[PDB]
Amino acid sequence: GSDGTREFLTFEVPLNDSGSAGLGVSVKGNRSKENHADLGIFVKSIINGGAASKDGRLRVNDQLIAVNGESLLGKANQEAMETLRRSMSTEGNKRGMIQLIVARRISRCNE
Amino acid sequence: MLAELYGSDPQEELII
């Protein structure tokens, strides 16, 4: 029974091609204007010149779940950004490689 | 060229 399920893919990005950007992804958060609640953080543009792009090969409009093991699935967009900024850098250069858990919604409208 | 989406949002983007 698999139709409209969402899968979590984990990309591990070493801080090698880092400096060009951190990972080289652009993310943004959106809010449901109807639900008056955040939809979470989604990828908007991949920077083709960053380790996450090179190694991970992630996509646009994917939904960011967790970063370096720390999850943002549950906290608001502005909260999430703080968690990201802090963990992507502070724990990123700490681990040496940064772990990104992103979610893929099985739907045809996906890029 | 104007009026894209609908809402007072500057699109909160974060680049990693």
Q: How far apart are CA A95 and CA A68, in angstroms?
A: 8
**B13 closest CB neighbour out of A24, A28, A47:** A28
> Which residues from chain A sit within 8 angstroms of residue B16, using beta carbons?
21-27, 52, 84-85, 88
Looking at 1.10.3720.10, 3.30.930.10, 2.30.42.10, 1.10.3470.10, the CATH number of the domain A1-111 comes to: 2.30.42.10
Q: Is A51 strand, coil or helix?
A: helix
What technique was this entry resolved by? NMR
Per the structure block, which two tokens stand in for B1?
A: 């060229």
CA-nearest residue to A76 within chain B is B12
Q: Check: CB of residue A100 under 8 Å from CB of residue A52.
A: yes
Place of tokens 């380790």: A51
Note whether B7 and A31 are within 8 A (CB).
Answer: no
Q: How far is B7 from chain A (nearest CA, A)?
A: 8
CA A107/CA A88 separation, integer angstroms: 29
Rounded Cα–Cα distance for residues A97 and A91 (Å):
9
CB atoms within 10 A of CB A3: 6
User: Which residues have C-beta within 8 Å of that of residue A69, sequence separation ≥ 6?
Assistant: A91, A99
Q: Are A30 and A42 in contact (CB under 8 A)?
A: yes
Indicate if the alpha-carbon torsion angle A100, A45, A15, A22 is positive or negative.
negative
By the 10 Å C-beta count (0-12 exposed, 13-18 middle, 19+ buried), B5 is classed as: exposed
Cα separation, A108 vs B9, in Å, equals 27
Q: Is A53 left (phi over 0), alpha (psi -120 to 50) or beta?
A: alpha
Residues after which chain A has a gap (C–N > 2.5 Å): none
- Alpha-carbon separation of residue B2 from A19, B8, B10 (angstroms): 35, 13, 14
